[PDB]
């Protein structure tokens, strides 16, 4: 529930491996480069950034957010973070055919199949799929996500977020 603090190191160009987005007058993590300092401190897609070096992010554009990181003084950048405020978890059961009951494309749920476990469990469309049974699927291709779902046993537990 509460915000955690993270401390990251810059590279030479002053980067941490992070793209940010403006949403409802907050700032959110949109992309996290592999093997970056951002990645190492556990920042993910959907995390809200409340502060960068004690300075409030409220009302900032993403262009302003990035500028503040690039021009930050010293070797360490501190951020105050709220872990994915929008994330929910849904558990479904595959039926006889081995399906839970939804259509997806580009990591977003686009349709709920009638009277499937996804239907019973109130899975919503226009929602990105973040994790499936522990496995993060952000930045993966649809085929890798469909294969994760295939070799899954019966219980399929996904975390989702509204696309926003």
């Amino acid at each position: 529930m509460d915000p955690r603090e993270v401390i990251l190191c810059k590279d030479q160009d002053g980067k941490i491996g992070l793209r940010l987005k403006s949403i409802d007058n907050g700032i959110f993590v949109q992309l996290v480069q592999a093997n970056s300092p951002a990645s190492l401190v556990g920042l993910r897609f959907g995390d809200q950034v409340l502060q960068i070096n004690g300075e409030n992010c409220a009302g900032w554009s993403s262009d302003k957010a990035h500028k503040v990181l690039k021009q930050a003084f010293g070797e360490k950048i501190t951020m105050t973070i709220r872990d994915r405020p929008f994330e929910r978890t849904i558990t479904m059961h595959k039926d006889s055919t081995g399906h839970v009951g939804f259509i997806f494309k580009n990591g977003k749920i686009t349709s709920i199949v009638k009277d499937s476990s996804a239907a019973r469990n109130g899975l919503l469309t226009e929602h990105n799929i973040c994790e499936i049974n522990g496995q993060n699927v952000i930045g993966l291709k649809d085929s890798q996500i469909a294969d994760i779902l295939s070799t899954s046993g019966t219980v399929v537990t996904i975390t989702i977020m509204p696309a926003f």
Binding site: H99, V100, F102, I103, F104, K105, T110, V113, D142, S143, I145, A146, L149, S150
Partner: peptide, 5 residues
């Protein structure tokens, strides 16, 4: 493409 799953 899509993936019914």
């Amino acid at each position: 493409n899509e993936y019914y799953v």
